[PDB]
Amino acid sequence: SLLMWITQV
Amino acid sequence: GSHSMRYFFTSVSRPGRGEPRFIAVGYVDDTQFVRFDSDAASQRMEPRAPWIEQEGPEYWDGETRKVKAHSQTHRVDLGTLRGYYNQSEAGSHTVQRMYGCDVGSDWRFLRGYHQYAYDGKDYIALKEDLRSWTAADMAAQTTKHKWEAAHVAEQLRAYLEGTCVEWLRRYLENGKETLQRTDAPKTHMTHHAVSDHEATLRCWALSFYPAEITLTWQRDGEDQTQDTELVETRPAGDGTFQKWAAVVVPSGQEQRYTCHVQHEGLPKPLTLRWEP
Amino acid sequence: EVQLLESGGGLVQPGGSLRLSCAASGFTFSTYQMSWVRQAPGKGLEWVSGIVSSGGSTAYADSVKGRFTISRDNSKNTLYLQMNSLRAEDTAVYYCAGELLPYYGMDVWGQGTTVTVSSASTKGPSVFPLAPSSKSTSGGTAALGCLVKDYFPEPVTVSWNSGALTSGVHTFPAVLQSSGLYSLSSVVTVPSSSLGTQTYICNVNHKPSNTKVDKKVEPK
Amino acid sequence: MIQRTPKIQVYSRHPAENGKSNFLNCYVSGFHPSDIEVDLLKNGERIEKVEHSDLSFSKDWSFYLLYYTEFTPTEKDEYACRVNHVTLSQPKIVKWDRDM
Amino acid sequence: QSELTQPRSVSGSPGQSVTISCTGTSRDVGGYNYVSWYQQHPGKAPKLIIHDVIERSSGVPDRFSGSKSGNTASLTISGLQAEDEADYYCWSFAGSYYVFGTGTDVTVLGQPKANPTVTLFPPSSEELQANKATLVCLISDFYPGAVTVAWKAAGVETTKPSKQSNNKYAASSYLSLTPEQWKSHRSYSCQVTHEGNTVEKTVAPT
């Protein structure tokens, strides 16, 4: 199951 | 034995075209189980293994929303990175991201990973402590400062030590017939005469699962590495793996050589010798 | 049928800690991503933190990072917020809220629990009856207090016979006075004829000071 | 970028038996960037029905793909894999050798 | 801060339309297609009305519609009705968190005047025996929510009006100061003026 929080670089 | 779950994301800008390509795949150990491809018609996360199809529509809907969140993040990143490296709007560039977790034979957390690449080299990576970052170059320090400020590591840590490992356990259980199987290598040796002066002995391991295996040559019981070739372990296409190792030997000296095969499906390692 | 019910809100000094709880009923709590959202009095909504359906993976607003911890336990259908290093600006109504799918927006909400971060001491109210006048009785109608006077923090609850009386009763929003103390009034509109038969006790509760008073209001 | 040239192995899924249906595989790996052209050949000619795995990559960031097609091998017929990539001046051809 | 910027206030007469903007950045509104809108009535929890930019929640009519262009999302409410009066908040995914907009109050113009019911009490003997004296003026059932209360001529404390269950407003005014000042005067009275007209009340003896 994927991460739901992804921060932009 | 040990197990892992990993997600791999590839993001490729297409100038002149046409929106960047975004491909995501998930793996449990050496078994792929989901995919998403921006250029495919469904625009859904898709099952790539039979055991994942058991998951109900909440799951597929949830994973699809999240993979599109990843896609969209990567869409913005390609521009951001082009800015950091003072690059033109007209050249194709590649971003990759990999994250996941490992568990030991008791299925408890062992390690977590989250790394990011740009154009074929490291950009930024979470360290093993899951609390600090390694920035590969000057540009990546911008991101490092950015992510330190936002507590990104703590957020990743919570997933990697928690949610990552719990879903991995669930998959291992639900797909046990696939994922918890051990298929021991089927082994044999072949012999080919290079000329009157030399012969090649090739030791084969076929139809094994999981992919992890070791093939080694000995001569008179001493490790033999010179004049040896070992190919990468390769997929058979049926869910199993193949590998071979070879040694070039002097004519008449074949019987000195032994191939040694170690694999989870083997209680004791196998020893093979040329049988003419 | 679907319900989220928060508790644990109260008065705490700056630098202190409080744990909030949210008991969920009537839906499959274990499938929802859960959040805490707060709202400062007279102010807008602020998302505080969120946790995935299975627990484990969490996220926090910048304003609370390193100080708050969200957690759940699906066996007890309960969500928690442990709040540390509390600041005056953490004063708010805290709502529990959930979404089935990620990024949808929370569509199941609780009723809120009130958190007050202040160095001021709790004070229990005094309760006074406001008698129905024979000057305030024109014909078949009359009114009665209380009041309540002079308490901190909010709330504060008023009944007339154990919650049996539902219609006819008006308890007004509190005034916050210059002193820092609140006061409110509860009036019931009653028939002047029945100024004898049906009895009305002013039943006042102020939880944070552990105050309970029952004041009977009689024609003076 | 950092660019890497592909490794190529051509092989059958199962041990080869003349006249028996099987799968011919070309596994390409270790390359960067991801754009690659892979054809399976029968006596020098492109095989038209060929499928491939979803793009993935290794610890070192380099990509890998499996290309595959159903084939019924014989004594005479020559099979090969042909790969083109930016790192290559001309496509590279690797012959299938069964009796390895 | 990271806030999602909305206008403080918008208004319209019944049957008209308002539009409420919500601007963020590529971190949020411009980055994803995960903008939602909430409606919150006084004393209630927020209700989700729009999700995924344009999708209406169950029970929500087509006269509420969402959209976005670039970094700005919009909510348009057409066919304005009185019960549409509420605070509206946009909301977005922002990668590592969720964030609400600053909130917009929606006013529906032209609603009918409602006259204040006024109820006044004198201090209790109890309170007086405790050497204290509070006069209590309670103002209910009024619309619009602006009143002005006048007492005497110090010690005056009056609430801001807030909406009742019946969508009229209530307020209260409290007059303090000492039982000897109360003794004393021949009478005390509480205003109250609403929309040009005044309403007393009253009260004298001891």
Side-chain angles (χ1 to χ4, degrees), chain C residues 30 34 59 186 192:
Chain C
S30 80
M34 297 298 301
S186 187
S192 46

Side-chain angles (χ1 to χ4, degrees), chain B residues 14 41 65 83 162 202 225 229 267:
Chain B
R14 296 185 287 203
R65 289 167 75 92
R202 180 171 291 106
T225 229
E229 176 179 17

Side-chain angles (χ1 to χ4, degrees), chain B residues 60-95:
Chain B
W60 292 104
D61 296 339
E63 303 298 306
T64 296
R65 289 167 75 92
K66 286 185 297 189
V67 77
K68 288 180 179 158
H70 287 58
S71 176
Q72 280 286 81
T73 296
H74 279 284
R75 169 69 130 60
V76 172
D77 289 351
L78 282 164
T80 300
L81 283 156
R82 199 204 303 122
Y84 295 168
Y85 290 95
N86 343 285
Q87 282 164 342
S88 166
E89 266 193 60
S92 174
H93 299 268
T94 303
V95 167

Side-chain angles (χ1 to χ4, degrees), chain C residues 29 31-32 118 132 145 179 202:
Chain C
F29 173 77
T31 66
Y32 278 58
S118 175
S179 58
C202 203

Side-chain angles (χ1 to χ4, degrees), chain C residues 33 35 37 39 43-47 59-63 65 95 99 101-107 109-111 128-132 135-136 143-145 147-150 170 172-179 183-187 215-216 220, chain E residues 1-2 34-36 38 40 43-48 50-52 57 89 91 93 96-102 119-127 130 132 134 136 138-140 155 157-159 162 164 170-172 174 176 202-205:
Chain C
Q33 334 311 138
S35 287
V37 169
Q39 181 164 40
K43 305 295 180 176
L45 301 175
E46 184 180 18
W47 184 81
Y60 298 91
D62 246 285
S63 59
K65 277 185 178 163
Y95 295 98
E99 56 181 355
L101 301 183
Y103 325 125
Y104 192 92
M106 296 79 65
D107 64 353
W109 289 74
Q111 58 188 56
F128 306 105
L130 307 165
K135 179 172 174 268
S136 186
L144 316 84
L147 204 80
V148 223
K149 233 80 204 163
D150 220 348
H170 203 18
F172 288 78
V175 64
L176 177 55
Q177 306 211 129
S178 291
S179 58
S183 292
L184 66 69
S185 287
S186 187
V187 296
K215 186 70 62 183
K216 272 223 300 98
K220 54 153 61 69
Chain E
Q1 325 85 210
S2 50
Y34 297 130
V35 181
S36 293
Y38 287 89
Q40 187 185 27
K44 285 179 90 66
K47 167 187 189 175
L48 184 68
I50 298 288
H51 64 90
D52 293 279
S57 296
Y89 299 86
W91 173 102
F93 182 57
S96 53
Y97 56 86
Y98 288 145
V99 51
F100 283 92
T102 53
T119 321
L120 177 72
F121 296 91
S124 276
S125 191
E126 309 78 320
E127 198 176 14
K132 290 287 196 137
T134 302
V136 178
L138 309 172
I139 314 158
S140 47
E157 229 81 13
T158 307
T159 65
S162 58
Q164 296 173 180
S172 306
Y174 294 85
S176 286
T202 246
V203 99

Side-chain angles (χ1 to χ4, degrees), chain D residues 58-94:
Chain D
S58 307
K59 198 193 73 289
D60 70 352
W61 307 109
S62 63
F63 295 100
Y64 61 86
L65 286 164
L66 178 61
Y67 286 76
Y68 58 93
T69 192
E70 205 145 17
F71 86 135
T72 301
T74 62
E75 212 89 286
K76 279 224 291 270
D77 288 326
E78 296 177 15
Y79 291 94
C81 183
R82 166 136 70 32
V83 175
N84 206 185
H85 192 250
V86 245
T87 56
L88 300 171
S89 63
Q90 298 295 344
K92 184 171 289 186
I93 295 145
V94 179

